[PDB]
Design a protein around this nucleic acid. Sequence first.
RNA 1: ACUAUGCCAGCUGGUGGAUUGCUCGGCUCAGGCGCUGAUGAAGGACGUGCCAAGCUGCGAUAAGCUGUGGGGAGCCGCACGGAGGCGAAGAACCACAGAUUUCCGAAUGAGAAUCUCUCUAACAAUUGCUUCGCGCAAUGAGGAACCCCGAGAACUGAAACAUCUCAGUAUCGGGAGGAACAGAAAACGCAACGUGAUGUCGUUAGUAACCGCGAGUGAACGCGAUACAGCCCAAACCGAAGCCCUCACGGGCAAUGUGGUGUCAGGGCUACCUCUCAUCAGCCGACCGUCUUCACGAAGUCUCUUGGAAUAGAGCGUGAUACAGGGUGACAACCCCGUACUGAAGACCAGUACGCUGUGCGGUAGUGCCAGAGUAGCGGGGGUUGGAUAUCCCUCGCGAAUAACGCAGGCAUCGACUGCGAAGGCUAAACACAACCUGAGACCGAUAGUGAACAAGUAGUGUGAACGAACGCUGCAAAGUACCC
Lengths: 49, 119, 49, 81
Amino acid sequence: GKKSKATKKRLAKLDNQNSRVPAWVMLKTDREVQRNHKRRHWRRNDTDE
Amino acid sequence: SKQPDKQRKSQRRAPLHERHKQVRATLSADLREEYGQRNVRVNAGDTVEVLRGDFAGEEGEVINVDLDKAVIHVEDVTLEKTDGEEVPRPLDTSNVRVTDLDLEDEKREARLESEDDSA
Amino acid sequence: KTQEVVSLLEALDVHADIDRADETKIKAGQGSARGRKYRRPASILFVTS
Amino acid sequence: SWDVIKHPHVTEKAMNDMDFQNKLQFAVDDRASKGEVADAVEEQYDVTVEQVNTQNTMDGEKKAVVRLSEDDDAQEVASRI
RNA sequence: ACUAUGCCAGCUGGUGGAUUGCUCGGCUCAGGCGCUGAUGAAGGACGUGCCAAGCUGCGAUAAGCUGUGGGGAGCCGCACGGAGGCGAAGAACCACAGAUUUCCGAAUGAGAAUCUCUCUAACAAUUGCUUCGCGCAAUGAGGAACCCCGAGAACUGAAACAUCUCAGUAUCGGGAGGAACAGAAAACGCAACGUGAUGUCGUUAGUAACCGCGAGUGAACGCGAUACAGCCCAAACCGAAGCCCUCACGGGCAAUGUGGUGUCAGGGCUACCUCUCAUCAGCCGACCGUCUUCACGAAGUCUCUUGGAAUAGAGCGUGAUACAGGGUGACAACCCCGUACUGAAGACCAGUACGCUGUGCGGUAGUGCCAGAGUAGCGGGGGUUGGAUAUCCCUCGCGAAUAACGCAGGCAUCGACUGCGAAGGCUAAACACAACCUGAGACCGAUAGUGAACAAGUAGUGUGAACGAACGCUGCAAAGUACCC
Ligand SMILES: [Cl-]
Ligand SMILES: [K+]
Ligand SMILES: [Mg+2]
Ligand SMILES: [Mg+2]
Ligand SMILES: [Mg+2]
Ligand SMILES: [Mg+2]
Ligand SMILES: [Mg+2]
Ligand SMILES: [Mg+2]
Ligand SMILES: [Mg+2]
Ligand SMILES: [Mg+2]
Ligand SMILES: [Mg+2]
Ligand SMILES: [Mg+2]
Ligand SMILES: [Mg+2]
Ligand SMILES: [Mg+2]
Ligand SMILES: [Mg+2]
Ligand SMILES: [Mg+2]
Ligand code: NA
Ligand code: NA
Ligand code: NA
Ligand code: NA
Ligand code: NA
Ligand code: NA
Ligand code: NA
Ligand code: NA
Ligand code: NA
Ligand code: NA
Ligand code: NA
Ligand code: NA
Ligand code: NA
Ligand code: NA
């Protein structure tokens, strides 16, 4: 397909949202924060684009 | 509120400037007589005596005050970690009594001596 | 002053009821979660004009 | 109210463009055109801009590849900042 | 004495997460308060941190900038890390006010799935005024329900079913406000020598009335309360004496009538008598009360015993206009927050009441000068209602009178009697809801209670409309296990 610039920004963001919770955030929180629940796989999941 | 859930909430959720009142400790008889106050906001630099718990009877200077956890560190009141390091055993201020005051700040001293104000 | 009333009651031989009522029961059950933790005996009714 | 140049884009590919091609790489505002990039780069670094190539990337930013004239030396300009 | 594969019951250790205990969440009641938006809201998108994935905050000045007040020796959100910084030049934090506030969005120059295009140019569209120029303005969209105006079912009940019922309900269209709507009688009709705007609550009463007279349906006047408030035009008679914009000049409106008078206590006119009271337009402008926030705030942290820890037991003391509730290493009025008392502020009551300025009320006699028409009323066809020959409304047709007249008093006509003046208009207060603030509880207590105590409208499902979980608890203190194999 052919993406627009806005679509491109949105896809970019979804990729950024796929990061892990940083190691240092787990230390800062005494492990109260571990999993990223919005974790998305390209195959198994589906975006809104 | 008379309701216990509300009372605890308002204590845990109190904004920073309302937490000073959670770090207060009773004054020694002498200091009570001197400033006409039953207790004070504990400052780092005050000297304090431990009235309750494993450390009761010990005296020492106050090294740290944490408003968020409503807790103080007192010199030499410590626990030994597994590696041998010495770390503070944090204390609730209501287990503690202030023997000496750090008066180095004009504002605090003024409030202490005021009849109509409380430090 | 409350203490004045104490002295008077002591003089009237009646103060022991206040002593009876000075103790609180921490109640069995979940009322404490609603603010109903405590109760105490009833002692003296004072009727004025 | 937005600035044109966000920051130099520093990666190995950027270094090769700097060393071999006399080009500098920037993260720039995605609202900026090639001309605006050329101008801003000239004003900030006191150089002469020959050519600008642009890309909207998958990081959500615009990347500009700015080739400098022979009177200017990219590695020298980059070493200042 | 042997016996495996096995059976039943225990024991030790698992698995599992019930139970008990706990509550940062719910549920429900109550008091207060209540509109936002073209000066671009609500909502959304995308950004924004030293490192930053989520949430929160914020907007290219981006977990923030400024001022005043409060607050105070700490702080750098949730979030306990590494580094580093800020704060006595008074930071953090709180209140009020201001600054900044990307893109989409009613979305408004035009187009577009949050981007783009151009004559740096646009209130698009509809509309009022209009210097006829988008020059000055208006509308649009949102909001938890509440409110008003329209459109309007069916399951169901009648033990079938058609009128009836469910029900003017669900749902749909339009629209207002902090409340709305109603409202100063062409009323009532305990018929009176009586009541006196409207809403609401209690009653009248399951009464009158409707109805295959089946099932069902179902008021009102009055009374007791709450709160109270009464007014302005049109016209007669006057006839430019007037209004709007602009600092001003000047412009616009207005004889198809601006303005004065006047409004059943009928008014006007003529001639009198009398008053400065009513009304209306203005100015000032609160107390108290209520809701919320805040300041100050008494008295043990003594002895022995137990315990890791006294908030336990025993002993000795103390305050109390404070023995509500909470926290603190276990049952705490006296350890800490608070609580009683007293005091301060803001908000609502309210631009209200009181006060004041201006205006001038009213009476007699005379006068057929004025007083709202497709109306009142009648007929045809429907809807609606308890409204029955006597509800309210729509539609087609017909159709008056002029106060010396007209309408009503639950069939029609005529007379009498009593009430009242339609076809112009405004109107405070008492009442509805619950977004928002706060308070409360013989409510639930993590399969309960919200779908949601946790990433909750999250994860996830569906092309979409829409659907939609589960997951709470180390410990007094991380002392969160160094060193060695
Ligand atoms: Cl009556
Ligand atoms: K009205
Ligand atoms: Mg990657
Ligand atoms: Mg003082
Ligand atoms: Mg039980
Ligand atoms: Mg290209
Ligand atoms: Mg547009
Ligand atoms: Mg049936
Ligand atoms: Mg039926
Ligand atoms: Mg039948
Ligand atoms: Mg009905
Ligand atoms: Mg009636
Ligand atoms: Mg007039
Ligand atoms: Mg009907
Ligand atoms: Mg649940
Ligand atoms: Mg399907
Ligand atoms: Na996919
Ligand atoms: Na960047
Ligand atoms: Na409100
Ligand atoms: Na983050
Ligand atoms: Na803002
Ligand atoms: Na406009
Ligand atoms: Na115009
Ligand atoms: Na039936
Ligand atoms: Na049937
Ligand atoms: Na019927
Ligand atoms: Na304590
Ligand atoms: Na008709
Ligand atoms: Na009548
Ligand atoms: Na659970």
